[PDB]
Design an enzyme around this catalytic site. Sequence first.
Site, short mmCIF file in Angstrom:
data_model
loop_
_atom_site.label_atom_id
_atom_site.label_comp_id
_atom_site.label_asym_id
_atom_site.label_seq_id
_atom_site.Cartn_x
_atom_site.Cartn_y
_atom_site.Cartn_z
N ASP A 196 -6.64 -1.82 -1.04
CA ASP A 196 -6.19 -1.20 -2.27
C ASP A 196 -4.76 -0.73 -2.29
O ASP A 196 -4.44 0.30 -1.69
CB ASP A 196 -7.17 -0.03 -2.56
N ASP A 252 -2.31 -2.90 -8.86
CA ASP A 252 -3.46 -2.38 -8.14
C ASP A 252 -4.48 -3.43 -7.77
O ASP A 252 -5.26 -3.86 -8.62
CB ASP A 252 -4.12 -1.26 -8.96
#
Length: 333
Positions: free
Chosen positions: A37, A219
């Site tokens: 992430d 992201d």
Amino acid sequence: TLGNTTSSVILTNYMDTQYYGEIGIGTPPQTFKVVFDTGSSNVWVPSSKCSTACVYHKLFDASDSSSYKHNGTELTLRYSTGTVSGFLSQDIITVGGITVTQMFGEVTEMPALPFMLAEFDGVVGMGFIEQAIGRVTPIFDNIISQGVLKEDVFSFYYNRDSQSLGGQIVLGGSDPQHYEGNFHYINLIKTGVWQIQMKGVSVGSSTLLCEDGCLALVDTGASYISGSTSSIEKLMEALGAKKRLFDYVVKCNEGPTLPDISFHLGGKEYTLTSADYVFQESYSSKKLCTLAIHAMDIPPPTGPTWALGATFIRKFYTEFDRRNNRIGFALAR
Ligand SMILES: Clc1ccc(N(C[C@@H]2CNC[C@H]2Cc2ccccc2)c2ccccc2)cc1
Ligand SMILES: Clc1ccc(N(C[C@@H]2CNC[C@H]2Cc2ccccc2)c2ccccc2)cc1
Ligand SMILES: *[C@@H]1O[C@H](CO)[C@@H](O)[C@H](O)[C@H]1NC(C)=O
């Protein structure tokens, strides 16, 4: 030693929403399915000291690790559904062959949502120390420190769902087999966050949103492309999509006729066609089809912002460059 290393981490694609690979924690290594992430900076996995989302995941047992170094400082990670709580621990972590001594979170409390739905165990934050909770050194900073990488960069490949590759992360470079042409770079607004300036969002050939500029967070941890509630209310109105509880839908037959959506980043227009954002599960006029674009109200300091998640990354192979503080996009293959 000599840095010519380009570690590949193979990812599993679960329904175009979850992209996870494995890491090994401890001596001997305890394996975990993790999401890599760029939107966060902490490493965390469930603890053996966990009481019930936990039940469904692999638990880290410190008592089975000879390399473990106690810490016990309380760790609290805010998610949009609640808190992921635990304590810090230190151990040896393996990712694509590279082994680093890492401070990570041993999680003892997870909200049932989204964790009951998660096919993966934990999270490996690919973000900067500026956003690390407890100012804990992120995994990539520690890999940089080893001076092993060819370049101070990492790349993401996310595929569209057959015994084919779900995704791939290259540490120290990019995989030219998973992209076509050359990369186009966009510098970060500031170091500390994988966020760039966006100069417009267009439906068809007309800029409908972000005309005065806005932020875009790249992201890898987010399943979809997202904007603020007000941006997505306007965008969905333009597309003719209807709101449901968790998403927006179109009649399945109307889906292949939906206009292209473009994101103006750097000097380019990044275009997603209806095939890139409609979950075309049917072609029936009697059925409803989901859009891979949602509203997500990211809180300050990072937010309010758009977030280019898996929906964008599937279309554009992304390279995160730490040496130069930029993100590069090339059309995925
Ligand atoms: Cl649809 C969807 C929405 C969110 C997620 N996330 C959380 C997001 C992924 N990066 C951090 C966060 C957004 C954010 C960025 C910056 C600041 C605040 C929030 C998630 C990732 C891994 C495990 C569990 C959840 C996943 C899918
Ligand atoms: Cl912060 C956060 C992250 C994800 C969610 N989700 C789950 C995600 C929405 N659909 C794919 C799924 C992927 C996922 C699964 C698990 C973890 C990450 C992504 C959710 C949305 C609506 C209702 C219930 C769940 C919610 C908050
Ligand atoms: C845990 O790690 C932090 C890192 O800053 C350190 O300051 C603290 O002293 C450590 N605590 C223990 C008990 O090892």
